[PDB]
Symmetry: C3
Subunit: 74 residues, 3 copies
Amino acid sequence: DAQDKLKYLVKQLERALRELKKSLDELERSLEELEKNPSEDALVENNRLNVENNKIIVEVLRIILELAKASAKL
Amino acid sequence: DAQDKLKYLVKQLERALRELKKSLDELERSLEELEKNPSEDALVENNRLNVENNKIIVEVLRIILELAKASAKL
Amino acid sequence: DAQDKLKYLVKQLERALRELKKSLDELERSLEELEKNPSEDALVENNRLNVENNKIIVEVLRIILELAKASAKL
Ligand SMILES: N[C@]12C[C@H]3C[C@H](C[C@H](C3)C1)C2
Ligand code: NA
């Protein structure tokens, strides 16, 4: 089962990275707006999106730990 | 030795992810306070915690590089 | 070819982590300046560097997905 589960975990990783990429693009657009017209409001929104992006990174790292455990059987 | 070292590196990864999770929870609480009562002070604290969270992510990635090197022997 | 490609991907990972580390050091220095003399300008620069650091993390994760695919052949 170990090889087949690895393949599934790799597909989960690809899905999560797609989600991370879309988040990163939103974050960068936020930073461009902030650099153009800085304000408290823009700053909070920018931070919100940075936090969200870190949260998704942690989810991606969780999947990599599951990949590492699956490997460390075989 | 390669298989046994891999198992140890996997335990190190699990420990570091526990630390990252606790950090993420602190960061999210900071963002909730910031969104409630935005101020310069809240903003700096929020950034401090975001930076700290990135620093731990880099430590987690270091461990994954060590896992990748251990794998690439066998 | 799978073993040799893995070795190459591991070297790519080491290069990218060197780049991430240098970024992290810049980000931390930014945060020290911000904590010393907080201002809107310092805040935007700090966020800029945090965003940049997340962007490099995503590139590092891309390489780890390529390492996971290379493994999941063998
Ligand atoms: N074999 C591994 C490939 C990839 C990098 C590292 C951790 C995970 C994901 C398993 C080694
Ligand atoms: Na920020």
